[PDB]
Write a protein that binds this ligand. Structure first.
Ligand code: HEM
Ligand code: HEM
Lengths: 132, 132
């Protein structure tokens, strides 16, 4: 998918309200936003800071990609998410987020972009796990 | 991401024409739909049939997931696609797809959906490839 700048949405009259009322949470460096389990469910967006999305297995970590400011992710991918800096997120449950999306579909490309990014990573990862 | 039913859109007045003008092509069981080094850019949607998506290196094919009636995909994922049965597709180029998307945002959910499954499939592939 194309790149996506979240600001073309937030600066626009359709977008500016998108996160109104989303709760705010701060994540200490080193802290786990998500474990591959029952964190809960919900979507969040990185306000500032930086998070690492990775997998394990054989007790070994594979980095997939990083989530910096403006990036959207969820609590249910089954990936691990840990803060590498103190980072702030806005969050809401799946349902509120769905609502907002249908009222401002242009903001759906951000979701498209983050899946594209996480997809290309995994694929490149897979190529590399084979070249040995 | 949420599951997507393309009929919801195609039956909507909003989206009934979405594939107007797309061209039709028939691939016979066994034929390659995508290479890596083909360098043609485009989107297609499966009308009927079944395609397999996989990657290759070191002469080891690895299957990721499959595409069936209603699923969308592209010619630039670097992924390799072969028809496991007689499969009819509709296609156009990225530009034309974009336009149709601008005009009918609800259809982007099918993009979110296919990127979505691709993601989950590649992850287990990784989870798998490691207990190995
Ligand atoms: C329909 C299913 C699609 C899939 C599975 C997909 C997947 C991908 C992947 C894996 C890449 C990584 C490029 C690489 O391997 O080097 C990519 C790049 C790209 N794709 Fe898509 N894509 C899809 C649809 C689209 C659409 C609809 C558009 C445009 C409207 C698009 C435009 C682009 C662009 C511009 C890039 C390069 C992004 C960059 O600058 O890094 N793709 N896509
Ligand atoms: C924002 C980035 C997101 C990513 C990377 C993502 C990824 C995933 C993954 C990997 C799964 C399967 C988990 C498993 O392996 O069991 C899943 C399931 C699911 N997610 Fe998401 N998701 C995202 C956002 C969303 C959003 C915005 C919604 C809104 C409805 C949503 C709703 C669902 C639903 C309903 C399922 C299970 C239903 C099905 O079988 O497709 N997710 N998602």
């Amino acid at each position: 998918p194309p790149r996506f700048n979240i600001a073309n949405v937030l600066l626009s009259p359709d977008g500016e309200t998108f996160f109104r009322g989303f709760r705010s949470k701060i994540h200490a460096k080193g802290s786990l936003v998500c474990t591959g389990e029952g964190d809960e469910n919900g979507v969040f967006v990185v306000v500032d800071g930086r998070l690492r999305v990775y997998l394990v297995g054989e007790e070994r970590e594979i980095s997939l990609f990083y989530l910096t400011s403006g990036d959207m992710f969820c609590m249910h991918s089954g990936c691990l998410v840990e803060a590498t800096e103190r980072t702030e997120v806005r969050f809401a449950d799946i349902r509120t987020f769905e609502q907002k999306l249908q009222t401002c579909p242009s903001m759906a490309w951000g979701l498209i972009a983050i899946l594209g990014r996480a997809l290309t990573s995994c694929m490149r990862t897979i190529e590399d796990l084979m070249h040995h």
